[PDB]
């Protein structure tokens, strides 16, 4: 899976940078030795997945040990953590030494990840179908489901992207994405390591941080559309950001659609374009605009190498006929953990995954996503948010009689979460802050409502 790390590297390749988080870093040899030390302490593991160097060591340790890692959002609330811990039943939690873990984890064995540790790299005995990660992802109803992603899916999606993006071990990625979803963790940490390149993770994203790295040796930027929107807003004021983007080898957006207004403001300011790729937790990456292809705003390009894609079958490349994307290939997840019926429902009889995403293809083969089959989802900041579980959390509040949750358009977030509340007392309805704080404390801050509306009645 990472031949630059296992077996332990030597000579020149060993002293190449691997991970950089501000002034902290690990070379390939250092990462292999720190992850090896950690791997020997863990013969399912949770990872307290802060946007910090320890998280890269932890996840690499789990992969070197052949043990599935379950990334935890360090801002998850008590309900969300309890569910993941009960469902995935990890043996221990890998954490940074200084982290303060919440009481939901009080009974789990804690293994501190020491980035200065030096141990052997374990023999690789893993098989291609073995679980690599369990990544919790929201559905439209109920608590999040654990997508079990096999080792083969990581290797294939990363090598497919390498071909599409002309990504090599000479590339230096900058990113500031969360490390408990596949965008930040699989593409943004495991990808550079599989290529033999490096990643500079910003900790918290900022336009200034991205510009600094791109002007100082970083060659690629990955972000969600919100980050590109903030880039587009800042460009007129920020000559160094414009030069940074103009000089980059590749700018990539994913997790949600990049609006054409943001695309064109970047192109107007910098003279170059942002590649979009389309993927999901359950499928990893399906399509992309290629580095050697035509840049076309509002498209997600062509199927990656090894991905079988169909629209439902719609045969014409007419830019009009709307159909459901379905995909098959070695990029696919294994199952939803503990959910064999939901797993079966997600697949056609002939083994294609039903994305729910609606698209056309143009005469060049390029896919344009244009909606959804039956049921809209909520994407806020490029996080997929499930309405049902926010409703269920709101219903616990004593000032809420009934709740419905929707998304509405937001130029920065894409969509923002709306809470529609039948109050306990219509003359004293609960304010937004009380409801937002409650959802943030139960689930996670990124899931909080940003708007509250009061009604007499909501759907049942
Ligand atoms: C952009 C933000 C910093 C903005 O945060 P706020 O302004 O609300 O604070 C945050 O929303 C953020 O970090 N977004 C990243 C969400 C993300 O990583 N999405 C990946 C899940 S989708 C996915 O994994 C599928 C895919 O990427 O193809
Ligand atoms: N570049 C993109 N354009 C439009 N939608 C996207 C893109 N990348 C991902 N998505 C959406 O994100 C979903 C996967 O996000 P997730 O559920 O977080 O794993 C897909 O089903 C799409 O709806
Ligand atoms: Mg609903």
TrEMBL record:
Malonyl-CoA binds at residues 183, 230, 255, 277, 379, 381-382, 450. InterPro entries: AMP-bd_C (IPR025110), AMP-bd_C_sf (IPR045851), AMP-binding_CS (IPR020845), AMP-dep_synth/lig_dom (IPR000873), ANL_N_sf (IPR042099). It comes from the Bacteria. GO terms for molecular function: CoA-ligase activity; nucleotide binding. Residues 13-337 form the AMP-dependent synthetase/ligase domain. Keywords: Nucleotide-binding. Residues 1-17 are annotated as: Disordered. Residues 389-460 form the AMP-binding enzyme C-terminal domain. It holds the Pfam family AMP-binding_C. PROSITE patterns: AMP_BINDING. AMP binds at residues 255, 276-277, 279, 281, 357, 379, 384. PANTHER family: ACYL-COA SYNTHETASE (PTHR43201), ACYL-COA SYNTHETASE FAMILY MEMBER 3 (PTHR43201:SF8). Belongs to the ATP-dependent AMP-binding enzyme family. This is Fatty acid synthase. It comes from Streptomyces coelicolor (strain ATCC BAA-471 / A3(2) / M145).
